[PDB]
Amino acid sequence: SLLNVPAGKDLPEDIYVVIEIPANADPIKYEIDKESGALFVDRFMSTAMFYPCNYGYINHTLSLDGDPVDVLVPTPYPLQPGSVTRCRPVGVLKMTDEAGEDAKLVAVPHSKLSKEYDHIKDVNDLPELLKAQIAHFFEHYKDLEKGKWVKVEGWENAEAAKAEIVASFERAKNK
Amino acid sequence: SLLNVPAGKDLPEDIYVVIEIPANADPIKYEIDKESGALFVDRFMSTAMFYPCNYGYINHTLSLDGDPVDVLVPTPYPLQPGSVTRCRPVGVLKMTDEAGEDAKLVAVPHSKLSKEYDHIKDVNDLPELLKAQIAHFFEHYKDLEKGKWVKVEGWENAEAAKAEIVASFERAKNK
Amino acid sequence: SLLNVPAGKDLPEDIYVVIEIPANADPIKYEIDKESGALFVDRFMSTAMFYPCNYGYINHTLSLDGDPVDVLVPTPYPLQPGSVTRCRPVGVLKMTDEAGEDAKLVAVPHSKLSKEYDHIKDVNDLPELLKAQIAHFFEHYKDLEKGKWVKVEGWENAEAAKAEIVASFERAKNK
Amino acid sequence: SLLNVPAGKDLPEDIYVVIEIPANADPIKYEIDKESGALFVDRFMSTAMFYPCNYGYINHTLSLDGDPVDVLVPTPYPLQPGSVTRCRPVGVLKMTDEAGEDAKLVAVPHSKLSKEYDHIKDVNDLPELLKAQIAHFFEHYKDLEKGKWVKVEGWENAEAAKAEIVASFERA
Amino acid sequence: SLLNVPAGKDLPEDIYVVIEIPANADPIKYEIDKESGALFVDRFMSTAMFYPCNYGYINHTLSLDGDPVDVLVPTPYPLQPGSVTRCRPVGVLKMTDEAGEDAKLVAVPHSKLSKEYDHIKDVNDLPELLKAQIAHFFEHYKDLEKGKWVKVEGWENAEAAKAEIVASFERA
Amino acid sequence: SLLNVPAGKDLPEDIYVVIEIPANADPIKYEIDKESGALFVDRFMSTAMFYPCNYGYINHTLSLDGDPVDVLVPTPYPLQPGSVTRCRPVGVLKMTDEAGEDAKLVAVPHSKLSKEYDHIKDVNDLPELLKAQIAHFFEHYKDLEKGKWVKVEGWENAEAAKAEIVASFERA
Ligand SMILES: [Zn+2]
Ligand SMILES: [Zn+2]
Ligand SMILES: [Zn+2]
Ligand SMILES: [Zn+2]
Ligand SMILES: [Zn+2]
Ligand SMILES: [Zn+2]
């Protein structure tokens, strides 16, 4: 059912993000199980931190880590885990962990859901506070997980985010 | 999965309502996507208003607008989006918008879920405050959406609500 | 989708519990519908009580009452109804109601989700307060439901809980 | 501040209830400290129960047990601990406990706050569910506290509640 | 305690707003009782609406209607009723109602609490959505109270808001 | 009201902590204003972190920095800002920051509120997770405030916490 959600109506400008974790929520790290399509509790986060945006993935995408492309979606109110939001990518936070590079895309609600993010075209239009919060969160959220750590390279633009979407959409397509 | 929820055990007295939006919640207007069966964020409501009851639809029904029949369900506590409640229709709020007539049925929890609505047989048994809140909500909730408005005709009885259920159940059945 | 959730990765030490009702929540008694797989509102609980743990079931199990095996899962934060948690059984509360014996297993989050329950190997490792709360809840929660009551026998160990899991997993398997 | 809240505008028909505990809330039993006037955590409730209504007291009253008159107030949404609600008494639940007799008044929001309770004149106009819940709650909430118990004796009417208010206003 | 909160550190550019109602909260209209200083439930709102911002007053001010100056304060998370927020006025919404003229100031968190509102100097720097919501909220929230209404006249600037603060500080 | 809360019933073993911030709550840093006694919004926290325990102070204490003694209190459910909890000190976390040395006491609910913390006699009886979270929280929560930092030095025992309470009680 979540397994049948499209990657988007018009990828990569117009995508759907399947939400796993709300912004500002308790430290329960939910993940959609690939086989069942169900919402699984993956971990109880150990640090006293919360995701600054809603966090989820684009369906029918395959990152180089073997999981779908991760996305953060700011909204005026937290979303329900398992809900799906139509959005437009505007940027991407690049980083490295105990297993190679990682990226966290950022996408904003689509103009048909709200007009309040229309002026966010690219990564520099986003509030600097929000960006600095996101960066800080990912550097530190796994600090108390044994054998796990993260370090942040920096922020890239919407074109780079779209390229990640496309490469991973094409990579999942090709077996 | 929600796609496989019946219209009811004994339509139109005994129906199931698939809940999309809780009573008294943040202004996130969720809708179940017809193809996928998933819970999609349709809009971030622009007015500072909330639904006075839980709001959802009856599955396997086709209104003249092309969507399933909408229903409001009062409960003592807000319900989870994506949950399904067995109820009994008691009434219907008629109205017109930028696209023709619309109706919002009202149904109360079934006696097997709670005895507290048993005395609500027809539309005049409902609290007048609740009715006036519902009417006011629908007149005003789209006031700040461009090219959108609503105006309310009035309240009709349980027989009329059941007729809407039946006509739309039969209309979906017939291709 | 919840219908396709396994009983576990390695039953009966390593099981999945499909959550229906969060700990410390409003008195809405949700149940997963067996046919549809959807989350149904079964009852509005009449007593002013809440479940001391999250409450759910193990999929692909058949108790002697005809329903899957019920499980309580303590967590540091309440879980979302419809989510799935990997856990390890440590005990079981035995009791009788208006229809024969019943058991409520207790299982703790699996070590891959959290290290905080690792020291809970068997039923006596659980906080005595929590146990006494669970026992009291089940004795009294149906006190105001007509023709319904419950009485508690006592607590049995992890081996007994695992035997219930196995017997009901094998019972569902065999038509 | 809470120390200076009136017992009421026109006692006993028109009173103020200082709220200590919301309806449907976590099992934290707050109580206003008499000396300071501050909101104290009195207990973490041991049973997995919640108060069916908001719970508090009428200021400037003293019951036989030396504490102010206790009151339950139903509202359409839970109230903030430390807030003060204008209400109209309608009933009283009589009980005994480990310390002896006890009484809990029930009062509904005053007509100037809401019309929704205008029809509740007396104890029997309250919903049967809510009454049954309250009785059950008080019967069982101390079940897991050693040496503490409650036996509910019964309900009494709005005249009975008003009489308690007056008598306890005078006692203070 | 709330009775002893200053009007501000450096009125009218630097003020304190006592909060009565959170943004996005249940429809319970609290109001600080002038005599006691306690948080009273004034009304259960009849329309299914919520305040777009936190709402409260500046202490030691008196408006022509005999009540203190009312203020809306946007914050990134809702504030607790009875809490006090240091802010900077930026605007005012002018309206009339069943009692006559009314004005609601808007003030943003002071730079020492957050940098997020530094760029809001004047009424037109506020988001157009939020302004439209506030106006709509005040236009309609009393629609289901008999004999009560509001017509919004318009917005005025930060100088206008400051002038109201000063004048009302003096009136008290 | 909060100004008149005792330091404790039997300091330093039996104290009262005035709560400013709940465990697991939105990133709003409230602080009781010393002059008024009212709950002020001191800051909107910039990092996406939450306090692992409820946080507050002991009234009628003064630390070397001129502010009252700070205390963390774990509870099974979060407490209301402005509420007062009877607890028993067990430990203290020592740190330094942009202003110099700092210390945060840890105290657990008193046995009359709950038996759940009776077994916690001293710093090492606290759960290792909670201790690690607290340390991490204080290490990082000011990471996005310019010119503000914390380096955690270490934990000290229940005797050390009691000594701080006494010394700071005397300083006031
Ligand atoms: Zn939260
Ligand atoms: Zn709400
Ligand atoms: Zn709850
Ligand atoms: Zn609650
Ligand atoms: Zn809300
Ligand atoms: Zn929280």
PDB file of C-alpha atoms in Angstrom, chain D residues 1 26-28 30 33 36-44 80-82, chain F residues 1-2 4-5 16 75-80 83-85 109 112-114:
ATOM      1  CA  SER D   1      -2.675  34.449  43.908  1.00  0.00           C
ATOM      2  CA  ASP D  26      -1.268  11.538  33.210  1.00  0.00           C
ATOM      3  CA  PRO D  27      -1.443   9.931  36.689  1.00  0.00           C
ATOM      4  CA  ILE D  28       0.192  12.852  38.535  1.00  0.00           C
ATOM      5  CA  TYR D  30      -1.061  17.659  42.080  1.00  0.00           C
ATOM      6  CA  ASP D  33       0.130  23.705  48.994  1.00  0.00           C
ATOM      7  CA  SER D  36       2.649  28.748  49.770  1.00  0.00           C
ATOM      8  CA  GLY D  37      -0.276  28.568  47.358  1.00  0.00           C
ATOM      9  CA  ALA D  38       1.994  26.722  44.883  1.00  0.00           C
ATOM     10  CA  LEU D  39       1.144  23.607  42.846  1.00  0.00           C
ATOM     11  CA  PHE D  40       2.831  20.626  44.528  1.00  0.00           C
ATOM     12  CA  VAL D  41       3.214  17.118  43.160  1.00  0.00           C
ATOM     13  CA  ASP D  42       1.469  15.141  45.915  1.00  0.00           C
ATOM     14  CA  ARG D  43       1.786  11.646  44.425  1.00  0.00           C
ATOM     15  CA  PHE D  44       2.414   9.585  41.302  1.00  0.00           C
ATOM     16  CA  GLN D  80      -4.902  23.668  33.049  1.00  0.00           C
ATOM     17  CA  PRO D  81      -3.751  22.796  36.628  1.00  0.00           C
ATOM     18  CA  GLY D  82      -3.895  26.017  38.645  1.00  0.00           C
TER      19      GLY D  82
ATOM     20  CA  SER F   1       3.661  31.986  45.631  1.00  0.00           C
ATOM     21  CA  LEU F   2       6.713  30.328  44.087  1.00  0.00           C
ATOM     22  CA  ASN F   4       7.308  31.482  49.150  1.00  0.00           C
ATOM     23  CA  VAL F   5       8.097  27.815  48.448  1.00  0.00           C
ATOM     24  CA  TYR F  16      11.542  20.968  47.089  1.00  0.00           C
ATOM     25  CA  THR F  75       9.712  11.259  36.969  1.00  0.00           C
ATOM     26  CA  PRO F  76       7.533   8.637  35.280  1.00  0.00           C
ATOM     27  CA  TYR F  77       5.545  11.446  33.542  1.00  0.00           C
ATOM     28  CA  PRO F  78       6.550  15.030  32.725  1.00  0.00           C
ATOM     29  CA  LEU F  79       5.679  17.709  35.280  1.00  0.00           C
ATOM     30  CA  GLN F  80       3.964  21.014  34.738  1.00  0.00           C
ATOM     31  CA  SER F  83       4.930  22.859  39.861  1.00  0.00           C
ATOM     32  CA  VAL F  84       6.935  21.863  42.898  1.00  0.00           C
ATOM     33  CA  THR F  85       8.287  18.393  43.564  1.00  0.00           C
ATOM     34  CA  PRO F 109      11.016  11.847  43.809  1.00  0.00           C
ATOM     35  CA  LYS F 112       5.928   9.778  49.874  1.00  0.00           C
ATOM     36  CA  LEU F 113       5.263  10.598  46.185  1.00  0.00           C
ATOM     37  CA  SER F 114       6.417   7.218  44.831  1.00  0.00           C
TER      38      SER F 114
END
